[PDB]
Symmetry: D2
Subunit: 476 residues, 4 copies
């Protein structure tokens, strides 16, 4: 029950950061004021697997101030802010397993430790807060392999590891089963539900739900309007250049920036690059998104067409093998490559790092310089992992306030309906009125005056004076 952090003496620095960011998160603060003295999450055991940053610390503190017990780990080996981990590990009923620059082996250990609440009966959490689906994955795969072992006596061999991170994952599961072949099966049965924060995690849930593999309720927090339209757009508009500037200090204006993918994240990234004066190039597979990109003055092309002159290459597709080895080998000298989508699959950093005749030179934390066979030296950020969270501090508190408000409401609704049959083992979405509520909490801070709908106006539009004001199909 002892937290594991880099250095507990950073707690005060983290505490100061939390106190300040409090004014930047009017949404979360409003939640504490309403459901505060009520303690609606009293006795609830919540395990979280989300970037251990300052904004995340304020989410933890909100959940615990709501009366819940928490075990937490980071969902990325570089996103953890040590001062935030130390500060949060100080709270009562909160245990944390996270630190910056953790190895892949240590990463899975933290996820497992966060999901394990002691031993024996009720060894798992009541609810899960995931960001990418790693905690959810471990549970589902654990249950899957435990059944395979109880039938064919077969264990997950890290031999068939199609990746280094997968090797540690399979190793963790193999050792887990050899210690207690029913651990995950018993835990999964007590889980009320999970709430997914990102597009990638939702994609995983949808595929499991499609094949009826979901063991418990899953709430799609990422598809909430006040999340995908704010977090994914305005957040990346902020943290992309921030991560690029801290990592390289290079000029962006007048430079050729290549953005792969023009969905929510791509739109946000491109907007900030355009405002700085960069020459934006977009790659896309979806014709609808491509036209949106062209209408903003961007040039839509295939990577092969611009890979030779590109100064910055940012992937925001949430797909795999977007920037292949053959592309990296053709880049100009001093080209910068980073991924802001998911894991490290978008860019074949591994293939490049293990290529014959490649020299890897570390410039600073999360920043490496690779010497290509032809002599060109390119820059790779966070070894292909989230550059905004690895080279910077991720989204600003004000943006994360929207996301964490939806997360909190997801946990509240899941816990308050645990004794009902409102939720099955499927993916659900938060109601429309909650989205408007979250938005309403941030209006004052923004000095935005909302107009009151009149009686005639209400009848004409066919809506209530309090909302919702749009239909469920509205795209905003």
């Amino acid at each position: 029950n002892k937290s594991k952090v880099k250095d507990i003496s950073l707690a005060p620095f983290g505490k100061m950061q939390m106190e300040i960011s409090e004014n930047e998160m009017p949404g979360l603060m409003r939640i504490r004021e309403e459901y505060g003295k009520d303690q609606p999450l009293k006795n609830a055991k919540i395990t979280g697997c989300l970037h251990m940053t300052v904004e995340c610390a304020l989410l933890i503190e909100t959940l615990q101030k709501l009366g819940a017990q928490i075990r937490w780990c980071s969902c990325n080996i570089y996103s953890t802010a040590d001062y935030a981990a130390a500060a949060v590990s100080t709270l009562e009923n909160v245990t944390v397993f996270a630190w910056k620059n953790e190895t892949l082996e240590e990463y899975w250990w933290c996820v497992e430790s966060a999901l394990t609440w002691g031993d024996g009966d009720d060894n798992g959490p009541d609810m899960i807060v995931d960001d990418g689906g790693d905690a959810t994955l471990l549970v589902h795969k654990g249950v899957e392999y435990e059944k395979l072992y109880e039938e064919k006596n077969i264990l997950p061999d890290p031999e068939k590891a199609k990746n280094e991170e997968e090797r540690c994952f399979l190793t963790l599961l193999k050792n887990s089963i050899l210690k207690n072949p029913k651990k995950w099966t018993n835990i999964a049965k007590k889980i009320i539900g999970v709430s997914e924060e990102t597009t990638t995690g939702v994609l995983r849930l949808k595929k499991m739900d499609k094949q009826n593999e979901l063991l418990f309720t899953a709430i799609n927090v990422n598809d909430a309007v006040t999340k995908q339209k704010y977090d994914n757009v305005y957040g990346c508009r902020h943290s992309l250049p921030d991560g690029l500037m801290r990592a390289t200090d290079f000029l962006i204006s007048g430079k050729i920036v290549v953005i792969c993918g023009y969905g929510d994240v791509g739109k946000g990234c491109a907007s900030s690059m355009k405002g700085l004066g960069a020459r934006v190039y977009i790659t896309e597979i979806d014709p609808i998104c491509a036209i949106q990109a062209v209408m903003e003055g961007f040039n839509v092309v295939t990577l092969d067409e611009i890979v030779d002159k590109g100064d910055f290459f940012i992937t925001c597709t949430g797909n795999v093998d977007v920037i292949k080895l053959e592309h990296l080998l053709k880049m100009k000298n001093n080209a910068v490559v980073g991924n802001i989508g998911h894991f490290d699959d978008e860019i074949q950093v591994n293939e490049l790092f293990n290529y014959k005749g490649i020299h890897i030179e570390n410039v600073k934390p999360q920043v490496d310089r690779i010497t290509l066979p032809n002599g060109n030296k390119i820059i790779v950020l966070a070894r292909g992992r989230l550059l905004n969270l690895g080279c910077a501090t991720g989204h600003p508190a004000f943006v994360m306030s929207f996301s964490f408000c939806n997360q909190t409401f997801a946990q509240l609704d899941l816990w308050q309906n645990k004794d009902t049959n409102k939720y099955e083992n499927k993916v659900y979405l938060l109601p429309k009125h909650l989205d408007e509520k979250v938005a309403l909490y941030h209006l004052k801070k923004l000095n935005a005056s909302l107009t009151e709908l009149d009686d005639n106006q209400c009848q004409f539009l066919g809506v209530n004076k309090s909302g919702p004001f749009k239909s469920n199909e509205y795209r905003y």
Copy 2:
């Protein structure tokens, strides 16, 4: 049946414009190349009620080249381009009833004439293309009043006219029933379906469908992605400043522009005003839209807060009484007021024009100068009706190509399934693949290179290499 247009000698000028805009509508031209020699709409009787512009002429030509017969009218008394009406009235199997500056009495006469195909059995059309729902309204109200007369022997009295335009509407219906009390009831029975082009028309359809008043199938073309995301946004970004410039020639940069409503149209309008250097103020009733407005650098306020210093006031709410008489009376000298939403309800132009001590002075077509009681002189555009179509030429052909492609596909699908039970008396949406198809047709013209999804990438995303690439809930 003979066409009724201003001057048929303008046909040549219109013909030249159509030939040129042909290159700007690759979408429509692609349709002619595929379903051309097939004549899928052969023997179909289509009645249209949409702005009679050059872009609309190319839509008519496409429908007739597909084998259909057409009767058409404009949906606005100022939007008709006489040279386009003359040109289209020239085509075989096409009859037109439209001209610029038509009176309200003449307007309804045109709608009725367009919907009436001869006399006796089968006196109505097979399908309807509407833009605002006026044709659809006439038919539904006609059936409603015809039943009221067949039961209580009561006729629609233009006495209870809550408006001048409504007076002519009720007068037209009263006369219609005194001539044939079953005209509309019999016509509504043969209508396969209608396809709505704008947000206002869809709102009308949704309300009727909510109360189960729909007499036939209705396709929501406005809610199609390649329409609400392109037409409503990029179209207005183009035609708002164009309408403002031609009507007043005033400088926009440095001026205080007040935009009411920040939905699709509002976002498009604000983007162009921002690009020109204006100081944009936004009014909103929806908190979610309000935050989007603030995140773009716009100040969100209530009209009462800025009505005194505003230089331009543009309504894009699609609501009623947004700019009341009390607001107009407080505006500065030379302030410009225009509506780009629906009809003339957004702004109380009528209340102002009939106010005691008000002097109305016509400056030029669709532009009037009003002298307020305090002596201030303000400028009102198109008497509160669509300023972009009244003072300019509406959206450009390239944008209308997306909308008209969805319209054509809507007519095609509706006609090809007339003998099936695919569509009931409800509001439907065109399939996802069609939206991507439409987008694909315009990529070449835009020099946009789409990327081909790989085999691994397809399985990972769980989509087909040809699309759709997004889920039905995707907001783009």
Copy 3:
């Protein structure tokens, strides 16, 4: 001697436009309020040669309200607004010779008529307001050729006409000398001075002054901060897209726009195209301007590199042969070509129009469609002349207010120092304090609150609390 205009019955329409634009020119209106009842220009004879637009009419009215007599003509054969010419010709002591679509022969006739005040002694004006230097040219060339005839008995032969417009010019001078070989020599002697409005006219004056050919004082109004920084930038940002929209109605967003020249005009043009969503490409010869263009996100290339995919080609160089015949022949179908710089030298429209196998088809006034040898049809605006003034109404009133305020001050200072030796036969610039004065007059209209410099702040900066606040070398 009466005015010569297209149709005097348009006077009322023009009057209405002048009354409204009055609120858009707080600068000129302030001048009338200060030097109004004083009549400082009483008895002064002013000849003007500037675009006869509504904004220009308000300048004429201001000069006459100051007590001067005026004879005016347009400096371009397409820029005249007939309703403005009719309205201004109505004023007392104002004679106008201008109309839209005048032939080159008629053009010079108007210039000569405007410069000729009766007959005999004092046959010329006291001061001149030029825009391009045509009136100034005629006087200088007239004096030059009159001396050549009085010595070698040689006359200007229109045979050596290196251009059609030059032929009419030499023809006019030849006839002028065969009627009175001392007309211009005597007129030039009574001219107090001239004030140049545009960059091109200033270039002409500087070359004459360099070779000591100036016969009278010339004031460089164009190099005035509140002119080149406002008019050339913000004015073009407004009239470029307006001219393009009225002439073609084509979509600009997503289109490839090629701007040649990135000086004051180019910067303004590009800013508007960028705001609309176009993909901007810039051509430059000056490396300093080229970097400015790149830092704004624009791609700097040579015409040859983009002439194949360009949708719009706009020249703003003020140079000759920027877009040669070889370039025009390689343009895509439906490509638009227009000049916004000087005369019709920037684009080789003449070479193209007289090329073998070329078909010219008039679409509408100032808009022609040319069929290239390969079949491609391109659009040419105003036959290579100012597209913003030919296809639209030029800069808005508010922007012209700054230029015309500097013009009025130039005329006032020139007339008030006619009996002094403050000005020689050289090019002078208006003092710094006047530039700030002009700017100050427009602040209230813009709701801009200026800050008052404090006592300590004044000493520190070493400036007066009233200005100037910058040094003469400041670039703003």
Copy 4:
């Protein structure tokens, strides 16, 4: 000959940064390739007083590679990058006295140490590179007080210290004179000249030159086009948000940002804030700049009008007392205040820090939180000193390349003309051709293709095919 730096072990980290930034400074690298093996600065003793950053390290290395000996110090107590100082102190013939977070006493010690080359005859440098004029100040004041002491036997008393930093300055001078009352007088006599980098330093030089106090030649590097138009604009566009983000991590979009001053720096700052989506408010004393601000969509107001709702307050005036104590006391909770202009005079941080009832709490390096009397807690950056260099890393290498190229050329020209009478004790500027030269060096890196002027075009414009292309009065 012993450098004084924080930790010499950071040398390798600094070296890696220098090697990378080399590719971002094609201008400086070109200088090394041309005047490299020539060693034009051989035996020259250069003392610099400029922000000891990585970009500065590359400038030092260039000067030494040119054959010069260097002694260097920082011109700000927070701008020094320790890893850069350590790396540069490694070079041969280079001595450095600088470190981050130095006290004011230590600051002047470094300046003095940098200007002192040994002892006895020739105890000073041959040339000086200044940024703010502190080194130049020390020398001029030193000579002034040395004469005052040699006449009235009066010493500079730190009693009359109108500031803490001035106290240390006068103390340094007093001790200097009590040790050798002719030190500075003798040194000033051997100084060939100095080259000023910033607007503030130039203002100081101009005031001395105006009163004939200049002891040696001064080159105004800041007024060079490729410096004020690139560095001051594009550099701040980059380092303003960067400093803001690293110091607070606060969201900028949708926030109210108040920029005081709209000159070169203000224009750059506002452009980046606008691109991020902030609501920009500008304060100005100059009417011309105010109109430029309004034409970009910004609201011009007096501080008193917005000081209550502002979220960020940035001063770019280069003036004194812009944000007084009475303004700071009225700011909202969590408001951020920072100066990017000169020293710490723009904002009365001192008055606030010494105000009764004020609590100062350090959040992190260069970031303090002040509790106001009414309880509001505001954030002050770098205690009123350059926030971009104190909270971040200043301008990016590519921008600094333009500035340092002009510096190098300034040193080269000054040293090559030391035995001539080309330069007097006045302020001079670099020739136009050099500005274009510097620009040309960076075109390739930017993928910008310059167009070659044609023979006819050259004669028409009256310029050489190689430039200059503009007149000295051109404002760009």
